Design a protein around this nucleic acid. Structure first.
Ligand SMILES: CN[C@@H]1[C@@H](O[C@H]2O[C@H](CO)[C@@H](N)[C@H](O)[C@H]2O)O[C@H]2C[C@@H](N)[C@@H](O[C@H]3[C@H](O)[C@@H](O)[C@H](N)C[C@@H]3N)O[C@@H]2[C@@H]1O
Ligand SMILES: CN[C@@H]1[C@@H](O[C@H]2O[C@H](CO)[C@@H](N)[C@H](O)[C@H]2O)O[C@H]2C[C@@H](N)[C@@H](O[C@H]3[C@H](O)[C@@H](O)[C@H](N)C[C@@H]3N)O[C@@H]2[C@@H]1O
Ligand SMILES: [Mg+2]
Ligand SMILES: [Mg+2]
Ligand SMILES: [Mg+2]
Ligand SMILES: [Mg+2]
Ligand SMILES: [Mg+2]
Ligand SMILES: [Mg+2]
Ligand SMILES: [Mg+2]
Ligand SMILES: [Mg+2]
Ligand SMILES: [Mg+2]
Ligand SMILES: [Mg+2]
Ligand SMILES: [Mg+2]
Ligand SMILES: [Mg+2]
Ligand SMILES: [Mg+2]
Ligand SMILES: [Mg+2]
Ligand SMILES: [Mg+2]
Ligand SMILES: [Mg+2]
Ligand SMILES: [Mg+2]
Ligand SMILES: [Mg+2]
Ligand SMILES: [Mg+2]
Ligand SMILES: [Mg+2]
Ligand SMILES: [Mg+2]
Ligand SMILES: [Mg+2]
Ligand SMILES: [Mg+2]
Ligand SMILES: [Mg+2]
Ligand SMILES: [Mg+2]
Lengths: 129, 88, 218
RNA sequence: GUAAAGCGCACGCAGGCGGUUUGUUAAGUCAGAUGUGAAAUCCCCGGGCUCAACCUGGGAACUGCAUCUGAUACUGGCAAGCUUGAGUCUCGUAGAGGGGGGUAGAAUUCCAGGUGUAGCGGUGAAAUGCGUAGAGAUCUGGAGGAAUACCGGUGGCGAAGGCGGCCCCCUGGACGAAGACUGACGCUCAGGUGCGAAAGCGUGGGGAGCAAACAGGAUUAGAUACCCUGGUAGUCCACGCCGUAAACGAUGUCGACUUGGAGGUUGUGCCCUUGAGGCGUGGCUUCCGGAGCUAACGCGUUAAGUCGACCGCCUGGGGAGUAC
RNA sequence: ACUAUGUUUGU
């Protein structure tokens, strides 16, 4: 009964890309906004905005290249039924470095590459290839 | 059952105002009134299993509301149950 | 604009959901093509047709419905290009090495009929070859002189001539199709929204294409 | 789903999981340090036995554990909230939803009588059977039980099992419109509890029709059957058991998202309501079909697609859902 | 109307 809003956000992206939709809207949370920030900086989504005051709606602008969805694979890793925490030396490399692993560290949400530079581990939120 | 006047009396007497119909005390009191009212019906119609299901739904809802009220603030919980005649 | 009034799309119930970008708010259970989006795509289709005609390419005009058979034939002949106005043969393009033998047979009977041995032989088998001729000519007359695969394919109805489109798709031949609201604009390389059955619309498309390839041959 | 595998269905304790914001904590998590992680073994560079095996130096490793210090994004704890999830109230709607009473008409059977007469009944054909002791047919009256023709509809309601003549009484749920209220009160659920077709069982009634068993007649090589003529339990009612079905959508529940078309049923908003209409918006339903999925069949917004939570279950066929 | 059956084992 909606026990994983993060996986819901990833599914909306995955289903929106499969449906070739321009944008996907969803209820907003600061964790979703943090994840959307990482996706935008990595180039997987064009943009996002958080319109709304008391019930904010985060809406992401999906990105298509040559008629194909930019996000080919987007997969939740640390689900509520099974949490995944990785130390710095065992952070995952997605698509041999061509993808990103969104990681929640004590210094914020970043990529696996950014977390490796910062020398931190944390929760593996998702893989984005 | 639980006619409009009976419902209106309960919410006024267990709620803050006449529009405080969503308070846990009002909801528990409304469920308690219907559960007590249906007691006579099921004494006569002991084979009315389909209606029993609605009654047991009321009992389960009241139990969950009471657990929430106990967890939130026990003082109102203890006050409510003695005012309604609960805990067996 | 230069084309309004003539064409209005099919009924809503038969609409292909992949035609939504080109649909402009069906009026009364009948879809209306967005002509504002029709004008640029049609121009770029014509522009590309001009370019390959400049490369001296072959344009095959494929319209098989009765209301557009003659229009396709005259337009292709006027712009001295090839056409298929009757039943498309499955494998006209993909099975060319077999249909090539068939147009060869058609050409031999053409010489036989006009100038060869066609009345110096038994009459029953004579008109047997006669009746074979128009059959073989009304199916392959428009492509007698291809000599190979065409370089472009202009289609009047995308879904009706779906066989030709996917024959071109797997062969790598660009497709310029008049895709109506009940067709899938997937195999078409250059989608042109608009009617696929109205006589005025089809002749208008064909006249524009016939003119454009003529200027491309200069 | 069909290969083994979704409990028959539901409620629900423990457990697992849990919307959104702020603060705090630092349990999980992460970082660093220190201690320890025996040696041997393994591995990497070497060295010595003529080589190798073997022996051996050094190092890496021992992926662990504990302590201290720090980080605070996430999860957890605590506190305060918020409204989207969930629930309450107001008005209305449809329904074979349930329980208890009453009642109506048709028909069957039986009982009595009138008319009337030699067949009736049954089958593939027959016979058993019924009939001159008066059948069958027809008409009148009466008794009794059971079920509710048409409506009736891939119609509706119910968690499932199931539920249809009509009327009354008691009663459950669902849905819609507009608001107001409470303010995660939620989801799932091992054990547990409840409901749960038919058959069956117990007690007491009832018994028209049908009918296991049984009997007779046929059929047949045989016929412990199919068919015919009868016919007991049972089918009905009350109460109490049983607790199983191809209890099936062979598809667990909950939530989210993802092209369409044609209907049905039931609300509701606006507009030319001009009239059953047009444009929306809900709930529940049927068919087809796109992507996608699938071994294929096929499913396809009511998914068997894309995901998340929890539960149940499977691990070749038999032996065996059997023994103990 | 209504019949039943078709020995074992190969390329
Ligand atoms: C409306 N969905 C239907 C579903 O409905 C079921 O679940 C719904 C849940 O709400 C219920 N409302 C409904 O009452 C119930 O029946 O039942 C299945 C049964 C399944 N054997 C299959 O049959 C198909 C066959 O597999 C196929 O061979 C045949 N061609 C067509 C059949 N539909 O497809 C249907 C179809 O998926
Ligand atoms: C105007 N025609 C109809 C309307 O009738 C009424 O509309 C107005 C009220 O709104 C009244 N003023 C008017 O007098 C009356 O005629 O009721 C709705 C009911 C709605 N559930 C839906 O069902 C259809 C749905 O499309 C779907 O549920 C199903 N597939 C098929 C249903 N017929 O579409 C019809 C349709 O819009
Ligand atoms: Mg089987
Ligand atoms: Mg199976
Ligand atoms: Mg089931
Ligand atoms: Mg439950
Ligand atoms: Mg529990
Ligand atoms: Mg949370
Ligand atoms: Mg700690
Ligand atoms: Mg050596
Ligand atoms: Mg070392
Ligand atoms: Mg050691
Ligand atoms: Mg915290
Ligand atoms: Mg917290
Ligand atoms: Mg408050
Ligand atoms: Mg259990
Ligand atoms: Mg029971
Ligand atoms: Mg029974
Ligand atoms: Mg009995
Ligand atoms: Mg019998
Ligand atoms: Mg079973
Ligand atoms: Mg059933
Ligand atoms: Mg089963
Ligand atoms: Mg289908
Ligand atoms: Mg499947
Ligand atoms: Mg047993
Ligand atoms: Mg034998």
């Amino acid at each position: 009964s909606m026990q994983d809003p993060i996986a819901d956000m990833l599914t909306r992206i995955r289903n929106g890309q499969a449906a070739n939709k321009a944008a996907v809207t969803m209820p907003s949370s600061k964790l979703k906004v943090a994840i959307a920030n990482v996706l935008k900086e990595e180039g997987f989504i064009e943009d996002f905005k958080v319109e709304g005051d008391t019930k904010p709606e985060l809406e992401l602008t999906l990105k298509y290249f040559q008629g194909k969805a930019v996000v080919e694979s987007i997969q939740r890793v640390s689900r509520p039924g099974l949490r995944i925490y990785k130390r710095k030396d065992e952070l995952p490399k997605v698509m041999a470095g061509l993808g990103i692993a969104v990681v929640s560290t004590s210094k914020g949400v970043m990529t696996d590459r950014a977390a490796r530079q910062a020398g931190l581990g944390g929760e593996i939120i998702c893989y984005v290839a | 059952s639980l006619s409009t006047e009976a419902t209106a009396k309960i919410v006024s007497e267990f709620g803050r105002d006449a529009n405080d119909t969503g308070s846990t005390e009002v909801q528990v009191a409304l469920l308690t009134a219907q559960i007590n009212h249906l007691q006579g019906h099921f004494a006569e119609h002991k084979k009315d299993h389909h209606s029993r299901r609605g009654l047991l739904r009321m009992v389960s809802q009241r139990r969950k509301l009471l657990d929430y009220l106990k967890r939130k603030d026990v003082a109102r919980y203890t006050q409510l149950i003695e005012r309604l005649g609960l805990r067996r | 604009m230069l084309k309004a009034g003539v064409h209005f799309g099919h009924q809503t119930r038969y609409w292909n959901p992949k035609m939504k970008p080109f649909i402009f708010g069906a009026r009364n259970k009948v879809h209306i093509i967005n002509l504002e989006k029709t004008v640029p795509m049609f121009n770029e289709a014509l522009a590309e047709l001009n370019k390959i005609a400049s490369r001296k390419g072959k344009i095959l005009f494929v319209g098989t419905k009765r209301a557009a058979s003659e229009a396709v034939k005259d337009a292709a002949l006027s712009c001295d290009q090839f056409f298929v106005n009757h039943r498309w043969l499955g494998g006209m393009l993909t099975n060319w090495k077999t249909v090539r033998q068939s147009i060869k047979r058609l050409k031999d009977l053409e010489t036989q009929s006009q100038d060869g041995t066609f009345d110096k032989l038994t009459k029953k088998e004579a008109l047997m070859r006669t009746r074979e001729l128009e059959k073989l000519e009304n199916s392959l007359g428009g492509i007698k002189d291809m000599g190979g695969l065409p370089d472009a394919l202009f289609v009047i109805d995308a879904d009706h001539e779906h066989i030709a489109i996917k024959e071109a798709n797997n062969l790598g031949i660009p497709v310029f199709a008049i895709v109506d609201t009940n067709s899938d604009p997937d195999g078409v390389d250059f989608v042109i929204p608009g009617n696929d059955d109205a006589i005025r619309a089809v002749t208008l498309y064909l006249g524009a294409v016939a003119a454009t390839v003529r200027e491309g041959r200069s």
